[PDB]
Design a protein around this ligand. Structure first.
Ligand SMILES: NC(=O)c1ccc[n+]([C@@H]2O[C@H](COP(=O)([O-])OP(=O)(O)OC[C@H]3O[C@@H](n4cnc5c(N)ncnc54)[C@H](O)[C@@H]3O)[C@@H](O)[C@H]2O)c1
Ligand SMILES: NC(=O)c1ccc[n+]([C@@H]2O[C@H](COP(=O)([O-])OP(=O)(O)OC[C@H]3O[C@@H](n4cnc5c(N)ncnc54)[C@H](O)[C@@H]3O)[C@@H](O)[C@H]2O)c1
Ligand SMILES: NC(=O)c1ccc[n+]([C@@H]2O[C@H](COP(=O)([O-])OP(=O)(O)OC[C@H]3O[C@@H](n4cnc5c(N)ncnc54)[C@H](O)[C@@H]3O)[C@@H](O)[C@H]2O)c1
Ligand SMILES: NC(=O)c1ccc[n+]([C@@H]2O[C@H](COP(=O)([O-])OP(=O)(O)OC[C@H]3O[C@@H](n4cnc5c(N)ncnc54)[C@H](O)[C@@H]3O)[C@@H](O)[C@H]2O)c1
Ligand SMILES: O=c1[nH]cnc2c1ncn2[C@@H]1O[C@H](COP(=O)(O)O)[C@@H](O)[C@H]1O
Ligand SMILES: O=c1[nH]cnc2c1ncn2[C@@H]1O[C@H](COP(=O)(O)O)[C@@H](O)[C@H]1O
Ligand SMILES: O=c1[nH]cnc2c1ncn2[C@@H]1O[C@H](COP(=O)(O)O)[C@@H](O)[C@H]1O
Ligand SMILES: O=c1[nH]cnc2c1ncn2[C@@H]1O[C@H](COP(=O)(O)O)[C@@H](O)[C@H]1O
Lengths: 357, 357, 357, 357
């Protein structure tokens, strides 16, 4: 009645200072004793918001403009309104997000079409009354403090502070300002990749952290600047540290299939920012450290996100985890076991042996 | 108030005999508490010359002929006049470099256009007289001793001794000859890659070393000869040794973006020789162990080098280093931390997931 | 419902090439669902004898002369008659062992006192009929071939070939001689310590091996000759090899408590030879690579061996092994777990903190 | 027909930088197919002397006066006459070694008692004549150059240069002097413990090396001076280097049993130098870095050295080595295998479990 324990526990992957990303490892399967589609996907975007689906849409002008934020909230995720735009435009934009369905309408009462929407979209993320949740990016420059006023009067729930570095005196100063002036506004950090720099943002009072820098599909920062972290290592090594204080970690960049979503959610992160996978769907709109564009068409979101939700929850089922909180327990108790891959051992992931596919 | 030490200190990368190059590692970010464009870039080229910008242009006929040496000096860097040419031509060439702007003109007084140039180009590298700095390559063969006379009477400041191996009895003999006959002329070694061979050139009296052999975009030496060193390991392991005596190390070859410049300067090198990145700009002109040519056009230098200077000093800011001397301190005190990458973990550096770019 | 695997599996101790011995490790406890004394203690002395208790008495003139061999057989173990004596004396000695109780007495019928002995000593080791089992040592010299005749006509069951080295051309030759001339006689090897030398004795046709050389309380061989093996490593590394062919391994020398008996029987050995622990009991009688004597009195055997049998079977109970065959299964399946000790971690074995004991 | 490789090869012990001595390891036994006492025990002492036994008596006032040097040469070994005495006494002393038995007596012819001695002592080490071999120590202070004259006119064959450090400019100078003035005199370098310092003595033209410093029973030096090696590591690491050029290695100090003689010769020394094991035999005679004396009576040397010769050659037989040249052939081919001892596996060398011994 004894059987050896195959594979590294989570801490034993990252005990070698080796720089793994999501491609470099696998999760060992475990005992299925539950039906394929009853696992619970609720995850925290900050200490005080739960989303009924862990998928976030990245604050960039190519992805979330006016309608991605609507759909992601109907689908129990969220969006962050971009900010390479005039502040009045962005504020009007989050306003036309918040008003899309309502409980007690204050500045047009109730309605019946809104209740039909409530019946049709059961996962929808709704704050209070019945309106949709929405976030936005705000910059770090001094003149962007004006934008907070328009956003606040426009009913935004949460904000990211956008900059490629989170551990700067300016971003900390901005977190202090927001947290002393607008105590109902939850704020989210700036692309951290190490526990020693997540500390300063946590002490400032940041209510959730997005993690990863210079790893991404449209993003060239590492290969032009030297700073970065292999983002599958980053998401574990910082969520190990942020879990002590309770702030959630949102995985950010390089997520280019469902497998990478499941790996990020097994390693510790609470939710995931999709960029270039959600870009070029139906409803998407002095040195240079970015890339121009060109993502191919990817259909309609309302038929796309359910595929992501079915894939992610099939992965959780076959790993053996009855919910995402159980998946993080199996991770931190050492019950999940992982295997490395040699470069060559990745090719038998369906890549070769066919004339076309 | 305790947080772990994420990543290898500098010495712990190269403690494994593993052959790293600039692609194989990343630098962990650190605290920004200074503005992005005030970090000091002054770097030594020999024990007795400082450049106001760490960028050098490689002595080859495809890069620096007559005008690259002018521009690099105006931009606070330098050039070395190539030497696959008749000695009189090369001497006339460094002469037409020195005369481009002047203090007291001896063999035409002063001028006003020269002072306008002084106002327009504030970084320019100059003698005590307002004339530009210039170096030259000189060969190792006996008959090339004649070239030293023309170069000396032509007002050259410094020389490289060209050959692909520096640790030869002939190059040492040539360093002794120059240092006993022309004591004002600073001399630079021949492409060393190990402390045990930098010793002989240092004892001869070499005033700076270029480091790296058979690693560089146009050079096939390793793949036809067996001798060489992974050049990111070479620059550290030899600058660890040369720092004791004070001679500068200049990193040489394979620098094909700004990230490689920042990595080379973080590892110990004082300055960097650009070849094929500066080749094919506006102002650029029995076995065979080199490659034919064909580099695409790269615009004008006066608008190109400032991009390099902005990128490099952005990298230094985000690492947290207030100057290049502070960057080398954070390196040798073990305060900089580095991560390895698997081959697979390099691909998420913006390479893939796009239809075109 | 997950809990880590504390301690090294058996193979993970001896995969470190560091020369462990019984003092230098511990066995981790395991689940008990059975009473202290039900565990089955039967073990094989050769491929074709089972003993109802695993203790053997060492063939030396200080231990087994005439009565130790009687008692050990009454107690379900065995003895080997010594051989530093005249062959006629030894043969008469094993004869006066075999005759001590009988079935059909051939050369005096049956008796009633013999059946009373059969009632009183239920563990007693007996061949066909009801006589006691007995072994003897025989030498390796040519003139000792005569002794085999007297021993054979005297009714010995099994023999050891005595020499301190087993892997010699002479011992192999002697095994062949005995196995072609007396096919009923089982023969036992000469103090082997490596699989590469157990091979030759196994191929000769040896039916069990005694393992260990130059480790033992009276034995100085290592400290005067250089040859040997740390005997707790020896017993595992050779029983890992002999188990393939089926021959049993008997652990030999350095057993100075019950803990060492249990450790030897966990590591693979089937039975154990006791020398200086059974020496100086009530019923015990050109270079020099041995020691003179002086073992203090140790009482009567009939009250001593049951203490050994209670201790050994208590150790098996607390490890959780329901029999000695289950204990070897838990060993080779990797279910037993072991811990090393630093030198400094052995003193807390009841040695210190007391004025007297 | 396959069986694993039990134990470390020779190079795999000392690849761990952990400072083993003779007590810290064992040699694995091997196949015997030869009789106990036929193994060829000849060894080189310098490039141009063979001894019919590897034991040497150490140059000290408590071991080597003429009575010892005689008895060792009769027993096929040697002695080095001590040198803390007046030069005339030492010269007279080696003269009374040489004259003890003769071929053609020049300054009294032949004799019959000398031929009786030749019949009685068959192993005796002798010149090209029949007179016994003798070495001596000579110092390295300049006034000791006088002693070389008396020793040379007295017929000494070989000399050690005695000083506790061999790698000094003075000992090198003395080797050059002797080798240019007295080319028939073989000279032995003093107490080296590293290949990097044996090089200078071999380049000076030393004809054999004494190896070990600060390890030895009367010698306190490591515990007073900081310099030294674990002498079982030193004898391997230096014989590995000296074997390239052909100079013999004599293992000096810490030899306190026959096992240590066999271990030194397995590790690659040609001969072994005995102090305290021969001190107090019947015919043995400003900082302090030595100990006073007090060694107990060791009996008569003609009945003692045959016990060393039987033990050393029994050890070789059981390792399986048919001669000492075969023992060093099995060493450097990696055919000998060694086991480390944990501290708690040395006690089992017959030390414990007895009331007296
Ligand atoms: N879409 C996203 O999620 C995302 C993520 C990262 C970066 N970005 C974008 O990347 C682009 C490149 O810029 P970046 O983000 O790398 O750096 P940035 O433009 O935020 O900042 C550039 C430099 O200026 C400094 N700076 C910023 N605010 C400052 C202030 N108030 N006072 C003084 N200095 C200040 C920063 O510390 C940094 O050193 C920007 O357009 C940004 O919006 C977007
Ligand atoms: N652009 C550069 O920085 C750069 C760097 C290396 C080589 N090169 C060029 O590549 C070509 C080959 O150069 P190389 O350095 O590989 O070899 P080289 O042409 O300098 O030397 C060729 C051979 O001659 C030997 N040699 C050189 N000088 C000698 C002397 N005075 N006396 C005796 N032997 C001598 C060398 O050891 C070598 O075996 C040359 O045209 C050189 O200018 C240019
Ligand atoms: N009590 C025991 O279980 C036990 C165990 C080991 C040794 N011993 C005793 O140790 C004592 C010391 O001797 P030992 O056993 O170490 O070695 P041994 O007496 O078996 O052999 C001594 C030498 O003779 C050689 N030899 C043995 N038989 C030979 C033959 N037929 N032909 C030629 N050469 C032969 C061996 O190779 C060895 O060199 C002996 O009295 C022996 O009985 C007893
Ligand atoms: N019995 C032995 O085989 C044995 C082995 C080693 C040392 N010793 C003894 O140890 C004792 C302590 O002395 P030691 O051997 O440690 O060192 P030492 O007395 O030989 O030398 C002491 C110092 O004087 C230096 N010295 C030697 N010759 C010199 C010269 N010509 N000019 C200048 N300096 C010179 C040495 O290099 C050293 O630094 C001596 O009596 C020596 O004989 C004996
Ligand atoms: O210009 C840029 N600088 C820094 N980060 C960027 C930039 N553009 C995109 N990103 C990152 O790219 C992520 C989108 O995921 P991706 O499509 O997998 O790369 C965003 O959430 C950002 O973290
Ligand atoms: O023919 C050659 N042999 C050896 N080294 C060369 C040769 N041509 C160029 N180099 C090296 O190539 C470096 C430039 O490399 P790059 O910047 O990658 O193009 C120069 O500074 C030289 O060190
Ligand atoms: O003289 C001897 N030489 C070699 N081995 C011996 C000698 N005497 C006893 N032994 C070994 O010592 C073992 C008993 O060790 P003990 O139980 O610790 O006393 C015996 O079974 C033999 O293997
Ligand atoms: O005063 C001393 N200084 C250094 N070495 C010494 C001194 N006296 C004796 N020796 C060494 O002490 C060792 C004693 O040899 P052992 O008695 O066989 O261990 C030999 O190697 C001697 O060369």
């Amino acid at each position: 009645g004894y059987v050896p324990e195959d594979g590294l526990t989570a801490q034993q992957l990252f005990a070698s200072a080796d720089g793994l990303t999501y491609n470099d490892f696998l999760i060992l399967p475990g005992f299925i004793d539950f039906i394929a589609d009853e696992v619970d996907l609720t995850s925290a975007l900050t200490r005080k918001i739960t989303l009924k689906t862990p998928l976030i849409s990245s604050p960039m002008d190519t992805v979330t403009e006016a309608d991605m934020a609507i759909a992601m909230a109907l689908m129990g995720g969220i969006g962050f309104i971009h900010h390479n735009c005039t502040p009045e435009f962005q504020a009007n934009e989050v306003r036309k997000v918040k008003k899309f369905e309502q409980g007690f309408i204050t500045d047009p009462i109730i309605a019946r079409t809104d209740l039909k929407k409530n019946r049709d979209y059961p996962l929808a993320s709704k704050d209070s009354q019945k309106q949709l949740l929405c976030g936005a990016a705000v910059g770090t420059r001094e003149d962007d403090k004006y934008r907070l006023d328009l956003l606040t009067q426009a009913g935004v729930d949460v904000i990211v502070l956008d900059s490629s570095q989170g551990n700067s005196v300016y971003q900390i100063a901005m977190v202090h300002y927001i947290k002393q002036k607008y105590p109902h506004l939850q704020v989210i950090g700036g692309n951290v990749v190490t526990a020693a720099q997540a500390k300063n943002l946590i002490d400032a009072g940041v209510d959730g952290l997005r993690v990863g820098m210079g790893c991404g599909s449209i993003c060239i920062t590492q290969e032009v600047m030297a700073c970065g972290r292999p983002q599958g290592t980053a998401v574990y090594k910082v969520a190990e540290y942020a879990r002590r204080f309770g702030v959630p970690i949102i995985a950010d960049g390089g997520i280019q299939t469902v497998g990478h979503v499941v790996k990020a959610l097994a390693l510790g992160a609470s939710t995931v920012m999709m960029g270039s996978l959600l870009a070029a769907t139906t409803e998407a709109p002095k040195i240079a450290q970015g890339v121009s564009g060109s993502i191919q068409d990817k259909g309609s979101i309302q038929k796309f996100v359910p595929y992501l939700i079915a894939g992610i929850q099939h992965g959780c089922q076959d790993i053996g985890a009855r919910s995402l909180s159980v998946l993080r327990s199996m991770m931190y108790s050492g019950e999940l076991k992982f295997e490395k891959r040699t470069m060559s051992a990745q090719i038998e992931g369906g890549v070769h042996g066919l004339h076309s596919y």
